Design an enzyme around this catalytic site. Structure first.
Site, PDB file in Angstrom:
ATOM      1  N   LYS A 104      14.414 -47.367  25.491  1.00  0.00           N
ATOM      2  CA  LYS A 104      15.690 -46.688  25.655  1.00  0.00           C
ATOM      3  C   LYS A 104      15.655 -45.865  26.929  1.00  0.00           C
ATOM      4  CE  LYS A 104      19.731 -46.077  23.589  1.00  0.00           C
ATOM      5  NZ  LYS A 104      20.522 -47.068  22.815  1.00  0.00           N
TER       6      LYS A 104
ATOM      7  N   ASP B 132      25.837 -48.688  25.187  1.00  0.00           N
ATOM      8  CA  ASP B 132      25.674 -47.702  24.123  1.00  0.00           C
ATOM      9  C   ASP B 132      26.802 -46.682  24.260  1.00  0.00           C
ATOM     10  OD1 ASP B 132      23.419 -47.285  21.976  1.00  0.00           O
ATOM     11  OD2 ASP B 132      23.873 -45.257  22.678  1.00  0.00           O
TER      12      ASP B 132
END
Lengths: 458, 458, 458, 458
Positions: free
Chosen positions: B112, B152
């Site tokens: 991430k 995201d």
């Protein structure tokens, strides 16, 4: 939402506080933007290191590398191997490394790396395996022209050798990426002595300016904490100059001189090799000559600041935040007049406030003087940079050559802080200027000017 | 001395507890070392990003990149641009990404990245400048075969385009490093709807197994929180199947249906386009058709869990830790039986404890069943991996083809957790097996075996 | 002054003599220079590998990698971990790999690597340590688009896993650089048995052409040496077709059948794990079902060519130079009519001369036929290239698809050698054409044309 | 199974036997492990070089590079272009390079490269094309900070120019990668005469210590073989110092002075010009001034050791193994007392044994003394390292400066071998210590300590 990093937060808050209480921002209101940029590390790397102990089990450790700023030059900072190392400690070490390099004047930046690996109690094979794995993980971001590691607490010549041995097996380059190495293969003379010599010279200059050159370390009692290379060599130098050292300390215990007297160089050498094997100070106090009760007293878990009574010079040189507010008041009552930091950020905020208030409320030599860590501790990095220049020239410099410049470096470092304090933070009549304010302002102005010229901020 | 990272610490403690309260460690006592190794990220990068706003002032922001584990495959994870992003949030997102990828069965690792940049209130020029400055520094470690960014919360197609522009300006390579891009230049169909479709399908399988396939979403009332794309498309899928959606939420307020009824597909688009401009939900409640007081009730600052009354399905999909113990008790009393996490770690630890206790204390459908976040939320990553495969094949897959696979992925993901729970955590008769325990055990066993075969631990 | 490399020198001399005793050089006199160039490897690498055993002692081994030629495509050849591995063995393995890839028709070059490490008697931790040390040194030249290694004698899935772990730790790339890996992470179906299936199909084609389709493996006796995957799976396939296997052998001894009969799938299956855990065959003969003296006879230290009596097909599949002239005469007298080499270069030079002379002196089925090792052994590389293409497509092929293709390759490989032999080495009437001559000429012409079109020679 | 490498095997056996017959392994039993590691080259590379001659035909040659050990620093060793070069010769050259570098004291390691290309009889265009192809192939591993090539037999300044011309086109860097270059673009003074000056100075020190300074080169007769730069400059220096040279040699024949006398510098100078064009010595003996039979006698195919009669100093400097056991006895009978090797391993094993036995059996100056090649021939590499340091400093050093240092290195290198032999291999009273034993032990101990500190072995 920033995390809690008490050491770095305290150091940055202190720097901002001593910057605000001066005329820097009044003359240059645009420099407030540079403070926001300079307080964020340029690049921080954390990697998992997995190694195998002698028992065949898997071990897990964290490796860090913090590269804080490079406006002045390429990255520099040794590897610190200590079980307490986390991101905050390396961050504030790099933050003060920046200004310590700026004050010296050498054109080279600040950074830091390390790990939480604990060499104590570890066999040679285990540390060899750890160093091999660590340099395998770290090799993707290193090089003599990008970051310059060195020695520090927890890292000796053996770990440096293992690191360099693994590094050559990946990149296959031989150059002075690491400093503090062996003298035969890239080291420099006086390097172990340099930090203590620099701090002693700085406090000597402080005394000379405060008393108009009327007294010196001859006839004085100096209080020293810690038993590292810096503290031991400062004690040796002040003994040679004519001072009296009264105490050496360690993390779990402190050894204090009894009555009048001073340590002798022969037993100091015995203390030196005691820490070489990473042993306990009490493990030697039970035998001669430290079994003698009349000269040596061992007090486990107690700092030497209040048990020592009357002193003249304090050089806290063991850990960070090793002088509390209460200890500061006792040191005032003991007759101390000059304090210098052997280690970076050795005094807590309350102690700094107490010393500053005492300096402001008194005139002349009656006021205690404070020497910040980023000023008096700058000898080692200066000689390390000179060693880098020597390895670039592929030449070896003698003991007397590098010992002469270290005298010149400290006299310039002291003047730079003192003169800048007079102009930006001019005090009332008869009160000595704030050395911490001057040193912080000088370093910050240099770094901010460099960053502005390089277009980091505008 | 580790820093305080509440989200990651909570997730890791939850995983360790659900592993310990089972027979995994009795059959395989050697897996403790794998748990020790797997909880440390492989590599974490933090870099300073300096960009210029429209007014010409210096801006400072932090960029992160957490690459957690790559035993299963190359790194994967989108960029999250939210003002609350710090190291802990990205760390726990990557930690659960590892197991979410493990359960789906595709070959991809966990990672991430993101920043604390806040797109809200920012013009196109400012966001373009930030994206250029961000991709300038991140580009030193990126690549399609080393780490796979995606979309995201906080990142749209516009930021993706700017990032790709700077990437192709610096490295000059064109490949599917980022997933979730535009369909014409590397995107895939059904991508926006995939997460909601997957969670709804998982809940449908859950109901079918719990009640022996006697009822479904039709004739039920489902409670949904959040107005993100996942919740929006989940509600749309429930409407299409025949259920009733009763509430949407936002960060500062929630809107709840009044009495019996359900939302219509046309109005859901109005909420959908409202969040496109990152505008507030309350800015639309004052006009038609949301100005009707008979259908829509706006309660700013309150969650819809205790104001809704009788419900059957809860799908908390807004933030992390959005259900407390009192909320769990209210949901239990309201008659809800099935809960699934739309977002990662929707419920706090006490809520998980309460649901598990109620499941243990009751038999049959009278016990409330819990679906962990790492199981029901896996649709998006699965279709992203399929998109990566399509870009590798340089072909386009139609809407119906990828919709069938997502149906097969969820039924396999549900079975994998269910079968593993029975064998490792066999309960008493008449009690549904712990889905959280089964999913955690399955993912952890897969990742631990994959790491062992590669020699990460031994 | 070249060093003495007996295996490679013998293979190259065989190829040169075979080319000379034909009309290739009469039609194309310029091809001699290509023969001069092709015999020198493009690049050979040797490196010291230092690894630590379980007892903490220093171990030293050698690593090799030979990249013989790449005119047809990137390098290909597995890692062979055997004590006897030196430069000569890998050189001749790569040399025959060139033409074996050329005959198959896929576009992939020849190469080989390995070491003198001895997996037998070594614990798993020692193997992991060696694999880490080996892939650390080899990582400087390896990659999926430059050299594609695989499995071979001495390397199994465990070493593949460890090597991949270190490769992904250093380079940080995931791709099909290694073939023969696990099926879940880049492997292919029916891969282990493909070599045996291919050799069996090739010799079946030989028989069908020789007796005009009047005979097959049904009702025949086949002699097999060795107990590797190739020999075991060839025995399995010929048993399934209707043949009778009469002997398996091993480096310390051979086990032949007594009287009429054949081994069954179960005993062959249990032999596999006997070699998987790497234990001597003699450790198994003393127990059931091999304790029966009526079916099994163990003659330690003797080859199964003389003691076996009458046979029809011999498939030497154990090591190089495993059949001498006396054994060739014995096989001729025993009634064998077809010789196929399971392993690369199984028959010695004198034996090959004897078989060729017997073929020349007799007409029709009375003359026995010889199959070169570089022709019948090409199934494994073909299916490995198909696996590479599958991993490029990121898709998995079913068992049936790869079985049909492998049958299609062998029929093309047989025709390619057969047709070329007639054109360039036309024999007298009633004499079967020389398969060795045809295969060598076909492979050499393809490789020489590829090099000429690429400007290697002129 | 290692291949047959006679030269390297001879050198390694000599070193192992020399170390064994001393107290090194008694004091340090752990050093036996370092011997196994140090005897395997770190990396050996072989590549095929294809180049076009003047007639347009394809030519094939083999290129080599051997990087033996880099514990002391980056690799060093010139390119040797001789038709006899293979792996064994370059391996043993690098093996003795390591210890020759260790004894001198400069911190840079050993290695070697070359080829079997034969410059003799080749036009300038052909060698330009070959060097272009060679440096194109070798460019993948070369670098000034990685491997330092130089000049050697068969390589002049012209080939160096061509190699650098091609190298700068690919890598595009200008630095001291090659030594022995032109003096205007990185060369150093005294460099051609350095090895000869070093060997003559070493043997002068040897004579002074043996005769207590009572005798020197004045009034002595020295026997020299070879006509290379080393032999020519050594003869020139000894003539200037007051010695008398009696013989020069070439590959196919030797020219020996007749009666009492010595060569004059004018004749010595023109022989160097004769070898510049790679012309034959016999092509000059047929004309003036070598047409005089009274002073010059050409004996083709015969070495000057037994045709010379009484001699005092022998300096075999033509090839390896140029003195066998039979000629070893003649040198003893002729009155010789001091032997030094101009080239590496001048004398065979039997001659070494004979000299050692005669030294052991006699006391005082009556015993012949043997100077190993790795000690006396260390001047050239020392001045090459000094040239590398100068190019790092980008400065030119005068002729007198570098000539003074070369006198210092030999005086230090002599005592290093002499003192170490005294302590580890103390002989009986009145017997001169074994210089070969001392030199081998000193070099090996230095290299082993460096490797241990770098973690190669443990």
């Amino acid at each position: 939402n920033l995390p809690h990093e008490p050491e770095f937060e305290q150091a940055y808050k202190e720097l901002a506080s001593t910057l605000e209480n001066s005329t820097l921002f009044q003359k240059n209101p645009e420099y407030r933007k540079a403070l926001a940029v300079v307080s964020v590390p340029e690049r921080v790397i954390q990697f998992r290191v997995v190694w195998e102990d002698d028992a065949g089990n898997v071990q897990v450790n964290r490796g860090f590398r913090v590269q804080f700023n490079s406006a002045l030059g390429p990255y520099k900072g040794g590897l610190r191997f200590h079980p307490s190392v986390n991101l905050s400690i390396l961050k504030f070490l790099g933050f003060e490394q920046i200004f310590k390099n700026a004050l010296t004047g050498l054109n080279m930046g600040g950074g830091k790396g390390g790990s939480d690996f604990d060499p104590k109690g570890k066999s040679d094979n285990e540390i060899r395996r750890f160093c091999v794995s660590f340099m395998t993980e770290l090799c993707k971001h290193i090089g003599a022209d990008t970051d310059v590691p060195a020695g520090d607490i927890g890292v000796t010549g053996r770990e440096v050798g293992f690191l360099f041995g693994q590094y050559r097996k990946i990149r296959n380059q031989w150059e002075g990426v690491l400093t503090g190495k062996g003298g035969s293969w890239g080291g420099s003379l006086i390097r172990p002595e340099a930090t203590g010599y620099g701090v002693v010279y700085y406090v000597e200059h402080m005394i000379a300016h405060a008393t108009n050159g009327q007294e010196s370390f001859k006839g004085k009692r100096v209080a020293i904490s810690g038993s590292g290379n810096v503290a031991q060599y400062a004690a040796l130098k002040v003994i040679e100059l004519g001072g009296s050292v009264v105490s050496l300390s360690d993390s779990q215990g402190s050894l204090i001189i009894n009555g009048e007297g001073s340590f002798t160089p022969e037993e100091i050498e015995l203390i030196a090799q005691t820490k070489v094997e990473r042993k306990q100070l009490a493990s030697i106090v039970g035998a001669a000559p430290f079994s003698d009760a009349n000269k040596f007293k061992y007090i486990a878990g107690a700092r030497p600041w209040v048990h020592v009574g009357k002193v003249d010079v304090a050089l806290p040189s063991a850990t960070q935040n090793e002088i509390s507010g209460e200890e500061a008041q006792v040191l005032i009552n003991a007759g101390c007049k000059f304090i210098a930091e052997g280690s970076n950020m050795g005094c807590t905020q309350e102690a700094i406030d107490t010393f500053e208030a005492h300096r402001t409320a008194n005139a002349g030599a009656a006021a205690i003087w404070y020497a910040p860590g980023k000023a008096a501790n700058a000898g080692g990095v200066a000689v390390s940079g000179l060693e880098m220049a020597q390895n670039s020239a592929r030449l070896s410099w003698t003991s007397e050559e590098v010992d002469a410049r270290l005298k010149d470096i400290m006299r310039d470092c002291f003047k730079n802080g003192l003169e800048t304090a007079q102009e930006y933070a001019t005090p009332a009549e008869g009160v000595l200027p704030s050395l911490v304010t001057g040193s912080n302002i000088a370093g910050f102005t240099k770094v901010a000017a460099a960053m502005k010229d390089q277009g980091d901020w505008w």
